Design a binder for this molecule. Structure first.
Ligand SMILES: [Ca+2]
Ligand SMILES: [Ca+2]
Ligand code: NA
Length: 134
């Protein structure tokens, strides 16, 4: 269980804050109590990962009363990071583009956030030059 080295490229401002790191450690710790990790197939690991992720989003208030992911919360959290204005523009464009694809391809609110997050993970890493080394 090696600690990753992250190169944040042009997006160092996206680094999580101390409150976010402390929260995420405790929220995921609690989710794993009731959704323990297997230690088998890729399919089983992924399902367990996705279940822990939904549990973590709900614990942090990421679904509104209708159960829809809070896309507008995500958008505002990007702006609150205070990226360089040109980089902020590019990151907000990908938020809007990924949201539109997710909500067109899926009616299911969980499938929507999985597609949105997959789309943001790929596109934000490319624009920012983010590299994770384990
Ligand atoms: Ca760097
Ligand atoms: Ca379309
Ligand atoms: Na569903």
């Amino acid at each position: 269980a090696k600690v990753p080295v992250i190169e944040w490229g042009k997006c160092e401002q996206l680094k999580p804050s101390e409150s976010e790191r402390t929260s995420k450690a405790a929220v995921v710790d609690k989710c794993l109590q009731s959704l323990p990790l297997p230690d088998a197939t890729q399919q089983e690991i992924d399902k367990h990962r996705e279940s822990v992720t939904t549990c973590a989003l709900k614990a942090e208030g990421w679904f509104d009363d209708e159960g829809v992911y809070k896309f507008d919360r995500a958008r505002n959290e990007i702006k609150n990071k205070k990226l360089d204005s040109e980089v902020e523009e590019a990151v907000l464009l990908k938020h809007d583009a990924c949201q539109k694809e997710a909500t067109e391809k899926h009616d299911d609110y969980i499938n929507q956030v999985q597609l949105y997050q997959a789309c943001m993970d790929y596109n934000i890493s490319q624009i920012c030059g983010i590299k994770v080394m384990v």
